[PDB]
C-alpha cells in the first residue's frame, strides 16, 4: 500500500476517518465533500464535530448542514497549500509531492510551536500573578 504517515494524502483514507459524522446525505458537508477539502474527523467529548486539515492542521468545529467545506477552509486558512493543488494525487511528480510533504512537516512544526507558545504564555501569566498577589501586602 502506501506508508502510514503519508496516508492522509489519500482522500479515501480521509473519508474513512469519519465515524459517527452527523452530517450526511442531504448535507453539503458530507464526509466525502469534507475529505475532498482535506479534513479528517478528530472528535472529542466537548467538540464531537471537530475536524482538521491534514495539511495545514487548521481545526474547525460547529459545522452546519449547508457548510461547504472548501469554502470554510479557504476562509479560515487561505494560506493552505493543499488548497492550491489542482492535480489529482497520482498525477503528482515525486518532486512535487516531496516538496509538498515538506511544507506539511513545516506546517506541523508551526502549529505545535504556536501551541507550546500559548501554553507558556498562560503559565507566565499565572506565575506573574502569584508574584503580584505577594507584593500586594
Amino acid at each position: 500500500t502506501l506508508p502510514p504517515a503519508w496516508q492522509p494524502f489519500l482522500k479515501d483514507h480521509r473519508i474513512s476517518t469519519f465515524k459517527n459524522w452527523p452530517f450526511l446525505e442531504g448535507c453539503a458537508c458530507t464526509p466525502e465533500r469534507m475529505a475532498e477539502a482535506g479534513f479528517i474527523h478528530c472528535p472529542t467529548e466537548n467538540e464531537p464535530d471537530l475536524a482538521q486539515c491534514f495539511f495545514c492542521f487548521k481545526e474547525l468545529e460547529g459545522w452546519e448542514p449547508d457548510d461547504d467545506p472548501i469554502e470554510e477552509h479557504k476562509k479560515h486558512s487561505s494560506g493552505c497549500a493543499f488548497l492550491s493543488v489542482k492535480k489529482q494525487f497520482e498525477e503528482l511528480t515525486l518532486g512535487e509531492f516531496l516538496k509538498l510533504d515538506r511544507e506539511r512537516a513545516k506546517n506541523k512544526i508551526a502549529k505545535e510551536t504556536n501551541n507550546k507558545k500559548k501554553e507558556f504564555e498562560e503559565t507566565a501569566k499565572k506565575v506573574r500573578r502569584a508574584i503580584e498577589q505577594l507584593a500586594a501586602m
Binding site: K58, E59, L60, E61, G62, W63, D67
Partner: peptide, 4 residues
Amino acid sequence: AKER
C-alpha cells in the same frame, strides 16, 4: 463553522 468557527475555530477551536
